[PDB]
């Protein structure tokens, strides 16, 4: 006689969660980072002891078929088509999965702060969007963990390491021009 719930309180964590909230779950392998998921629905055994949460998985970059790449953020996650059902007591705690822009905005990034720019197909490994804007001499996409400086000459952004330079030196500049200017 299961009925969908409004919210559930998770005691061991001692926090309450709602459908749409982003949560971390304890992985089968304890030496691995916490699973990231989005709560679609919360369901109960009538009035009973057991509670189960149905989630839509966020895939970590090294958790996907393609594997982590150099332009993937440390706190990056993919929104996928993969849903399955897990019990509530998995929930290790809560997290925020930010849009790309709003991640950039954050003053400081919490252990629990993530971001998403891709949709992921767990079966095929295909991404949406297919392609993204690239920068610097590497012609790699933006990695928000990487410090970059702007040559207004080209208006392109460069990793200091890829352009003759130390990081500390790059931070100095107000006046930058790449070698093609």
């Amino acid at each position: 006689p299961r009925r969908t719930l409004d919210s559930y309180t998770v005691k061991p964590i001692n926090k309450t969660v709602k459908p749409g909230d982003c949560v971390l779950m304890r992985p089968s392998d304890p030496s691995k980072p916490s699973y990231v998921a989005k709560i679609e629905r919360i369901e109960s055994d009538g009035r009973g002891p057991n509670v189960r949460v149905r989630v839509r998985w966020y895939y970590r970059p090294e958790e996907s078929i393609g594997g982590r790449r150099q332009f993937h953020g440390s706190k990056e996650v993919f929104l996928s088509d993969h849903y399955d059902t897990q019990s509530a007591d998995t929930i290790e705690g809560k997290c925020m999965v930010h849009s790309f822009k709003n991640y950039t905005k954050l003053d400081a990034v919490g252990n629990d702060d993530f971001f998403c720019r891709f949709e992921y197909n767990s079966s095929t490994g295909a991404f949406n969007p297919d392609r993204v804007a690239v920068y610097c001499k590497c012609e790699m996409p933006y990695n928000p963990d990487d410090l970059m400086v702007q040559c207004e000459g080209c208006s392109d952004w460069f990793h200091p390491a890829c352009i003759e330079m130390s990081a500390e030196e790059a931070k100095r500049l107000d006046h930058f021009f790449c070698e093609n200017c």
């Binding site: 089968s28 998985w57 767990s122």
Partner: peptide, 16 residues
Amino acid sequence: ATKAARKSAPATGGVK
């Protein structure tokens, strides 16, 4: 006590 999460396999279904 934090249960451990068991995930499924991509593109699979429950027969029941």
